[PDB]
């Protein structure tokens, strides 16, 4: 119930929300059906429109007008945005040359430059260039400030997950807004775009920027605008708020546009009808900047122009129907569209079975435009699994397609020509970032980055301490003139042991064999030096990774590679080696095919054993340092040490062996050498974080050898590829992956073909940031470079996307 007979007189767009049943005058009251009776009359005035004209200049103040052109309007803070231009001979902001803003130039009483976030729904990254002729205000912001060529959204590339990610710095799995539609089984409640349940506070986890600000004594304008409030009125409301007295005035503001998304759905991303919405958004930007110029705030405020996601061409005819695959289609509930999420229609049906649904959806049609996954098998870069609102069965839909349950769902709901929601590495889903203001850099282009990083920066721009989030604070310091955040490297928690030769061969009873009993003071001193670390500067280029948790591990040196060997997990946490451009690939000789050799530095009790692999009919093994890349026949023996062995399903070995035999050398040739760090990952609870020993769900049969869920590699070289990887003076270049360790290759529909037709494709799907691997291993990489730490943080957040330009 609302008692709507209170009044909004003097309360229009009040910042504090008053309590039911008392009627509301804030910019949300419409959305709750709670505004006071006179809200439209007082707060949504429209008379005479939004622009001054010569005849209105000087006019007698009429309080009915939407905005004012009278002489007292500047002092009142409610002039039309073009007032000084029409009436006082001033230029529009867009017509002024840009001039570097070296320091904030702010009115007296201003404690800090305010921040205005100008968010645009569905603003695809390529609009900045493709629409630049019709967006002159945005183009000035872009060219004069700091811009990225694009910004990567989070998955799913839908509105609310992305806007809330912007506000919180959190992946959707952590903030809880995992789609525009959701079912939460603990609450037994549904979240929808339409209607009221979405305002219930239990949906919204983490701590958004407005709450962070408020808790630290920084006042915030509203972030949500009711759709019926016109854009011109949103802008005038912000400008009015900026004219409040110092004790009442907010420091952070947001504007939101429903465009160009609204039109992009109807017309496609580049429909000829899209020009006008881009013109209109640019006009709104111009109103804001003209309004700030009038208030003398245009060289004081930091402005962020940012989108939530892009827009792709999608039509009704490009729909796959689950009724063409499943017999049981009425026993499921599908969240449809540009992603699929499946669960049982009824929790009373014990005949429901995910394995049979997955199998019925796997590689069934030759051009099939979706791929099913148990959520824990989705690419780890998506960070889309650790929330009870994400259904166990997921369909990753190809760009340009939809999935639906049955045809009747599509024609009883062609209308649309655009949609979004796809995998966040798809080029059409990329969106925009521009920062303009005293705290941003001048005429600066920065590389593409992920929207999860912005919360930290917005916190820095307002002097706030960010709440815990998934950004890497410092990774965007290169966007900023000042207010940089100067982090220190985390302290190492566990220091390594450096074991020497402590065990005789006969102490081992591992069931392993090796044809190796074959024999010199010249080369005996030499192999001793390699086991003490004499080649380690070549193989460990950026220092040893730091272990950020309590554990017991050994550093093991060898001619061709260095490793950190875990006594707890019985395998390396990491293995580091450098392959020059000139390295040669050799085979595993016949006599060494089944060779595994005890490591005399490491006790039997802290070693793997071959009997386990013999007994485990499902499990085989691989090696972290590949025998194919040994520097010499004698060095090759090192690669067969039991301390370099890891558990691998035979199906996964096809992937791994192709990576190691073909791809590493290919990358060294293309990149002028590479440094490779490889290792296992254990994430049985799919939380994106290193598992402890007691979370491991699978072991090599009959043993304590834990089975990884994933294998990673981090592949580093010189950005200036005229320098070899091992003699690089400047910035680094990286690509990494986190490959799922699966007992089948059902993910790869073409896996019966030669690995040259499908392995690399799989690896690109599972591309990762170094930071993703850090979370999953508790390791900290690149500890010893000649580079700045901020630069290294940027490197650690880089994702190699494999999309064209
Ligand atoms: C991305 O960044 C985020 C933020 O930094 C990272 O997320 C954090 O990760 C931590 C580890 O997973 C986690 O720490 C736990 O916090 C528990 C208390 O948490 C509550 O309070 C916080 C702070 O105000 C709040 O933010 C939380 O909100 C969650 O839950 C509500 C819904 O109920 C949502 O509104 C919200 O969206 C959020 O959900 C998300 O997080 C939870 C996990 O907290 C998930 O379950 C959801 O799926 C969703 O993703 C909370 O309300 C604390 O109790 C935990 O402590 C246990 O474990 C420690 C280990 O040392 C142990 O000492 C204790 O014994 C304790 O165990 C006991 O409980 C166990 C579980 O019931 C039980 O089995 C045991 O036997 C014990 O009895 C723990 O410290 C932190 O809360 C989240 N924060 C957020 C915001 O998500 C995230 O990791 C980053 N991602 C990557 C990939 O890096
Ligand atoms: C989508 N949309 C908006 C714009 O919303 C936001 C704009 C920005 Cl710039 C940011 C950031 N950072 C955050 C939001 C936002 C606001 C919310 O408010 C709670 C009452 C629900 C909830 C989630 C959000 F993510 N207004 N109207 C409308 O339809
Ligand atoms: Ca959107
Ligand atoms: Ca885990
Ligand atoms: Na086996
Ligand atoms: Na297959
Ligand atoms: Zn949309």
CSV table of C-alpha atoms in Angstrom, one decimal, residues 147-313:
chain,number,residue,atom,x,y,z
A,147,UNK,CA,40.0,5.3,-24.5
A,148,UNK,CA,40.3,1.6,-25.1
A,149,UNK,CA,39.5,0.2,-28.6
A,150,UNK,CA,37.1,-2.0,-26.7
A,151,UNK,CA,36.1,-3.3,-23.3
A,152,UNK,CA,35.3,-6.9,-22.6
A,153,UNK,CA,32.0,-7.6,-20.8
A,154,UNK,CA,31.3,-10.5,-18.5
A,155,UNK,CA,29.4,-13.7,-19.5
A,156,UNK,CA,26.6,-13.8,-20.0
A,157,UNK,CA,26.7,-10.7,-22.1
A,158,UNK,CA,23.3,-9.5,-20.9
A,159,UNK,CA,22.3,-6.2,-19.3
A,160,UNK,CA,21.9,-6.7,-15.6
A,161,UNK,CA,24.8,-9.1,-15.1
A,162,UNK,CA,27.1,-6.5,-16.8
A,163,UNK,CA,25.7,-3.4,-15.2
A,164,UNK,CA,26.0,-5.0,-11.8
A,165,UNK,CA,29.5,-6.3,-12.6
A,166,UNK,CA,30.4,-2.6,-13.4
A,167,UNK,CA,29.0,-1.5,-10.0
A,168,UNK,CA,30.7,-4.3,-7.9
A,169,UNK,CA,33.8,-5.5,-9.6
A,170,UNK,CA,32.4,-9.1,-9.3
A,171,UNK,CA,31.8,-11.9,-11.6
A,172,UNK,CA,28.1,-12.8,-12.0
A,173,UNK,CA,28.6,-16.0,-10.2
A,174,UNK,CA,29.7,-14.0,-7.1
A,175,UNK,CA,27.3,-11.0,-7.3
A,176,UNK,CA,24.3,-13.4,-7.9
A,177,UNK,CA,22.9,-11.7,-11.1
A,178,UNK,CA,23.7,-14.6,-13.4
A,179,UNK,CA,21.2,-13.7,-16.0
A,180,UNK,CA,18.3,-11.4,-16.9
A,181,UNK,CA,16.1,-14.4,-15.8
A,182,UNK,CA,16.9,-16.6,-12.8
A,183,UNK,CA,15.5,-19.3,-10.5
A,184,UNK,CA,17.0,-19.5,-7.0
A,185,UNK,CA,16.1,-23.0,-5.6
A,186,UNK,CA,16.9,-22.1,-2.0
A,187,UNK,CA,14.4,-19.2,-2.0
A,188,UNK,CA,12.2,-21.0,-4.5
A,189,UNK,CA,11.9,-17.6,-6.2
A,190,UNK,CA,12.2,-16.3,-9.8
A,191,UNK,CA,13.9,-13.1,-11.0
A,192,UNK,CA,12.5,-11.5,-14.1
A,193,UNK,CA,13.1,-8.2,-16.0
A,194,UNK,CA,9.4,-7.4,-15.8
A,195,UNK,CA,7.9,-6.9,-12.4
A,196,UNK,CA,8.7,-6.4,-8.8
A,197,UNK,CA,10.7,-9.4,-7.3
A,198,UNK,CA,13.9,-8.1,-9.0
A,199,UNK,CA,13.9,-5.1,-6.4
A,200,UNK,CA,14.0,-7.6,-3.5
A,201,UNK,CA,17.5,-7.2,-2.0
A,202,UNK,CA,18.4,-10.9,-1.7
A,203,UNK,CA,19.1,-11.0,-5.4
A,204,UNK,CA,21.9,-8.5,-5.2
A,205,UNK,CA,25.2,-9.6,-3.6
A,206,UNK,CA,28.6,-8.0,-3.1
A,207,UNK,CA,28.8,-4.2,-2.5
A,208,UNK,CA,27.9,-1.8,-5.3
A,209,UNK,CA,29.7,1.5,-5.8
A,210,UNK,CA,26.9,3.6,-4.3
A,211,UNK,CA,26.9,1.5,-1.1
A,212,UNK,CA,30.7,1.7,-1.0
A,213,UNK,CA,30.6,5.5,-1.3
A,214,UNK,CA,27.8,5.9,1.3
A,215,UNK,CA,29.6,3.8,3.9
A,216,UNK,CA,32.7,5.8,3.5
A,217,UNK,CA,31.0,9.2,3.7
A,218,UNK,CA,30.8,9.9,0.0
A,219,UNK,CA,27.3,10.9,-1.2
A,220,UNK,CA,25.8,9.2,-4.2
A,221,UNK,CA,23.2,10.2,-6.8
A,222,UNK,CA,20.8,7.5,-8.0
A,223,UNK,CA,22.1,4.9,-10.3
A,224,UNK,CA,18.7,3.4,-11.6
A,225,UNK,CA,16.4,5.6,-13.8
A,226,UNK,CA,12.7,4.6,-14.3
A,227,UNK,CA,12.3,4.1,-18.0
A,228,UNK,CA,9.5,6.7,-18.4
A,229,UNK,CA,11.8,9.6,-17.2
A,230,UNK,CA,13.1,11.2,-20.4
A,231,UNK,CA,16.8,11.5,-21.0
A,232,UNK,CA,16.7,15.3,-20.9
A,233,UNK,CA,15.2,15.2,-17.4
A,234,UNK,CA,17.8,12.7,-16.2
A,235,UNK,CA,20.6,15.1,-17.3
A,236,UNK,CA,18.9,18.2,-15.8
A,237,UNK,CA,18.4,16.3,-12.5
A,238,UNK,CA,22.1,15.5,-12.4
A,239,UNK,CA,23.1,19.1,-13.2
A,240,UNK,CA,20.6,20.4,-10.5
A,241,UNK,CA,22.2,18.0,-8.0
A,242,UNK,CA,25.6,19.3,-8.9
A,243,UNK,CA,24.4,22.8,-7.8
A,244,UNK,CA,23.4,21.6,-4.3
A,245,UNK,CA,25.4,23.0,-1.3
A,246,UNK,CA,28.6,21.3,-0.5
A,247,UNK,CA,27.3,19.3,2.5
A,248,UNK,CA,24.4,17.9,0.4
A,249,UNK,CA,25.9,17.5,-3.1
A,250,UNK,CA,26.7,14.0,-4.3
A,251,UNK,CA,30.2,13.1,-5.5
A,252,UNK,CA,29.2,10.2,-7.8
A,253,UNK,CA,26.4,10.1,-10.4
A,254,UNK,CA,25.1,7.7,-13.1
A,255,UNK,CA,23.2,8.3,-16.3
A,256,UNK,CA,21.7,5.3,-18.2
A,257,UNK,CA,20.5,5.1,-21.7
A,258,UNK,CA,18.3,2.2,-23.0
A,259,UNK,CA,19.7,3.0,-26.4
A,260,UNK,CA,21.2,1.9,-28.7
A,261,UNK,CA,20.1,-1.6,-27.3
A,262,UNK,CA,16.4,-1.1,-27.8
A,263,UNK,CA,16.7,-0.3,-31.5
A,264,UNK,CA,19.6,-2.8,-32.0
A,265,UNK,CA,17.2,-5.6,-31.0
A,266,UNK,CA,14.7,-4.5,-33.7
A,267,UNK,CA,17.1,-3.5,-36.5
A,268,UNK,CA,20.3,-5.4,-36.0
A,269,UNK,CA,23.6,-3.8,-34.9
A,270,UNK,CA,24.1,-1.9,-38.2
A,271,UNK,CA,20.5,-1.5,-39.4
A,272,UNK,CA,20.1,1.9,-41.2
A,273,UNK,CA,17.6,2.7,-38.5
A,274,UNK,CA,20.6,2.7,-36.0
A,275,UNK,CA,22.0,6.0,-37.1
A,276,UNK,CA,19.3,8.1,-35.3
A,277,UNK,CA,19.7,6.4,-31.9
A,278,UNK,CA,23.4,7.1,-32.1
A,279,UNK,CA,22.8,10.7,-33.0
A,280,UNK,CA,20.3,11.0,-30.1
A,281,UNK,CA,22.8,9.6,-27.6
A,282,UNK,CA,25.5,12.0,-28.8
A,283,UNK,CA,23.0,14.8,-28.3
A,284,UNK,CA,22.5,13.8,-24.8
A,285,UNK,CA,26.2,13.7,-24.1
A,286,UNK,CA,26.4,17.2,-25.6
A,287,UNK,CA,23.7,18.4,-23.2
A,288,UNK,CA,25.6,17.1,-20.3
A,289,UNK,CA,28.9,18.6,-21.3
A,290,UNK,CA,27.3,22.0,-22.2
A,291,UNK,CA,25.6,21.9,-18.8
A,292,UNK,CA,28.8,21.1,-17.0
A,293,UNK,CA,30.5,23.9,-19.0
A,294,UNK,CA,27.8,26.3,-17.7
A,295,UNK,CA,28.4,25.3,-14.2
A,296,UNK,CA,32.2,25.7,-14.7
A,297,UNK,CA,32.6,21.9,-14.1
A,298,UNK,CA,33.7,20.7,-17.5
A,299,UNK,CA,37.4,20.7,-16.4
A,300,UNK,CA,36.6,19.4,-12.9
A,301,UNK,CA,34.3,16.3,-13.4
A,302,UNK,CA,35.7,12.9,-14.4
A,303,UNK,CA,33.3,11.3,-17.0
A,304,UNK,CA,33.2,7.6,-17.8
A,305,UNK,CA,31.4,6.6,-21.1
A,306,UNK,CA,30.9,2.9,-20.8
A,307,UNK,CA,28.7,0.2,-22.3
A,308,UNK,CA,27.4,-3.0,-20.9
A,309,UNK,CA,27.7,-5.3,-24.0
A,310,UNK,CA,27.5,-5.2,-27.8
A,311,UNK,CA,24.9,-6.5,-30.2
A,312,UNK,CA,25.0,-9.3,-32.9
A,313,UNK,CA,22.8,-10.1,-35.9
